Amino acid sequence: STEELFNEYKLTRPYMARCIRCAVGSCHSPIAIEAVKSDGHDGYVRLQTSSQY
Amino acid sequence: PGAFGDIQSRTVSSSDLYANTNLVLQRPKAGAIHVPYTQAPSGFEQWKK
């Protein structure tokens, strides 16, 4: 499992980005969503965000 | 734009890409850091529809 994350995390530093809705108006959110892909079949979506997992 | 073949690649692993999607850039909102743009919706997904 640790072989998959030499670079995708260890040098990456999640950022804070503009969000249009943060429960009050516009926003600079830590979980800003960059893309939502839903081209699969059974409701599975891949979501790119400013957070890291 | 907005039709099948709006973007084309010679091979699935090829390094070339012809793109024609009517991409245009809009002015950023006041006091905001982002790149607004307007495009014709994907021709592949419309073709699948």
State the gist of this model.
Chain B: It is found in: Virion membrane; Host cell membrane. This is part of a larger assembly, with chains A (53 residues) and B (49 residues). Chain A is built from no helices and 4 strands.
Overall geometry of chain A comes to flat
**Main sheet: strands, sense, barrel of chain A:** 2 strands, antiparallel
Distance between the termini of chain A: 13 Å
Largest sheet of chain B: 2 strands, antiparallel
Tell me what portion of residues of chain B adopts beta-strand conformation. Answer: 15-25%
Oligomer: part of a larger assembly
Radius of gyration of chain A: 14 Å
Biggest sheet: strand arrangement of chain A: 1-2
- Tally the beta strands of chain A: 4
Give the distance, in angstroms, between the N- and C-terminal Cα atoms of chain B.
16 Å
Helix content of chain B: 10-25%
Question: What proportion of the residues of chain A is helical, as a percent range?
Answer: under 10%
The DSSP helix count of chain B reads 1
Widest β-sheet, arrangement of strands of chain B: 1-2
Query: SSE string of chain B, helix = H, strand = E?
Result: EEEEH
Q: What does the model show?
A:
This is part of a larger assembly, with chains A (53 residues) and B (49 residues). Chain A is mainly beta and 53 residues long. Chain A has strands at 17-19, 27-29, 33-37, 46-49. Chain A is built from no helices and four strands. In chain A, the strands form two sheets. Chain A has a two-stranded antiparallel ribbon. Chain A has a two-stranded antiparallel ribbon with strand order 3-4. In chain A, a hairpin with an 8-residue loop joins β3 and β4. With 49 residues, chain B is an alpha+beta fold. Chain B is 12% helix and 16% strand. Chain B contains one helix and four strands. In chain B, the strands form two sheets. A two-stranded antiparallel ribbon of chain B has the order 1-2. In chain B, 2% of the residues are buried. The interface between A and B is small, with 3 and 4 residues.
